[PDB]
Amino acid sequence: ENKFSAKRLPSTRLGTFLENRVNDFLRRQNHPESGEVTVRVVHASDKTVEVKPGMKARFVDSGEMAESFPYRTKALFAFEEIDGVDLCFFGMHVQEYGSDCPPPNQRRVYISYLDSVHFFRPKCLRTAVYHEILIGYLEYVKKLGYTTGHIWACPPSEGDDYIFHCHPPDQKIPKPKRLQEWFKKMLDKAVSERIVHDYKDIFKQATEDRLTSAKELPYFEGDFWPNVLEESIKELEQEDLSQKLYATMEKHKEVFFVIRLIAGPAANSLPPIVDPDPLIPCDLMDGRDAFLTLARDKHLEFSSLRRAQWSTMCMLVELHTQSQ
Numbered sequence: 001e002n003k004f005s006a007k008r009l010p011s012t013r014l015g016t017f018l019e020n021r022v023n024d025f026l027r028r029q030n031h032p033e034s035g036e037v038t039v040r041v042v043h044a045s046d047k048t049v050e051v052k053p054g055m056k057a058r059f060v061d062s063g064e065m066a067e068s069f070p071y072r073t074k075a076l077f078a079f080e081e082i083d084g085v086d087l088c089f090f091g092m093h094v095q096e097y098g099s100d101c102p103p104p105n106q107r108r109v110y111i112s113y114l115d116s117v118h119f120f121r122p123k124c125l126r127t128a129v130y131h132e133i134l135i136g137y138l139e140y141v142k143k144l145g146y147t148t149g150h151i152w153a154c155p156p157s158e159g160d161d162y163i164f165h166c167h168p169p170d171q172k173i174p175k176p177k178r179l180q181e182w183f184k185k186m187l188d189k190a191v192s193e194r195i196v197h198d199y200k201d202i203f204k205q206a207t208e209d210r211l212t213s214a215k216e217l218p219y220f221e222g223d224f225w226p227n228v229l230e231e232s233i234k235e236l237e238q239e240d241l242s243q244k245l246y247a248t249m250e251k252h253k254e255v256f257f258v259i260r261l262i263a264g265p266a267a268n269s270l271p272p273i274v275d276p277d278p279l280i281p282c283d284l285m286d287g288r289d290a291f292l293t294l295a296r297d298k299h300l301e302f303s304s305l306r307r308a309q310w311s312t313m314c315m316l317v318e319l320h321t322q323s324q
């Protein structure tokens, strides 16, 4: 028995939900080479995103658009048991803008960052397991009353680690098209299960929505669009803001997914969003810097199966001894 295992991490309703979904899938496949997956929310805290000077001037100060949007941020990780030792192979960071959030951020979630380490066993279920987690998250927030999800299909630069320090040298970074097709395959799956109603690139979605002002575009921490509007307001300063937006959306439409989970009249009468889970203050999983620093300091790589398993044990040790 191992008092610092992933299974013994404090459970959450979300974590349970997700891992039950994955293990159900795994049991159905009945593959002799696979192991039990464990999913753990390891951080959850409330924050707000502050509207930046340019946009504040044109829209906030004149009472058209709230100064700040609050959201709950969360970090979660998934683990496979491979002959009795844990392996961390997947991490996700989300932003959840609840029902008492001012529009246009209301009832939306944003996937900040996705990362993995390609050591899941067997190789031929890795993509499927990533899909079951991602679809599982969508199913859950929908259940609770979030209407729309958002993804930015941004492949990193060579050497830029998103969550896991030092990737294997032979884990290819996907080209943008490949990453976009991969997300489409995942969302298609969720449409068949009637989880997602539909999904569209950001340009087509803003068109259908008859969006006319930049204040109507959701404002997410760390996202492309806040900074695009800023550079866009400096470019009008140096000489319409809506025409600039719609063009930047067109050029880059294929990278920005808008996923609709509840549409039509069903979205207009929803009860408030209440999170059955408590906050989880954990400085190590507060954004992606604290975990990446810890890995540099302790020379924890994630570049081979046995290295990543060693690194998993350390992260689990930290994680338990800070939750204690």
Ligand SMILES: O=C(Nc1ccc2[nH]ncc2n1)[C@H]1CCCN1C(=O)C1(c2ccc(Cl)cc2)CCCC1
Pocket: 090, 114, 115, 116, 117, 130, 154, 155, 156, 157, 158, 159, 160, 161, 162, 167, 168, 171, 172, 173, 174, 178, 179, 182
């Ligand atoms: O590649 C990644 N991260 C890496 C990989 C190798 C690396 N070398 N150096 C840095 C680096 N980062 C991250 C960043 C974007 C998507 N990632 C994924 O993991 C996921 C993915 C991987 C391949 C495909 Cl086709 C589609 C999706 C797997 C889990 C969910 C998304």
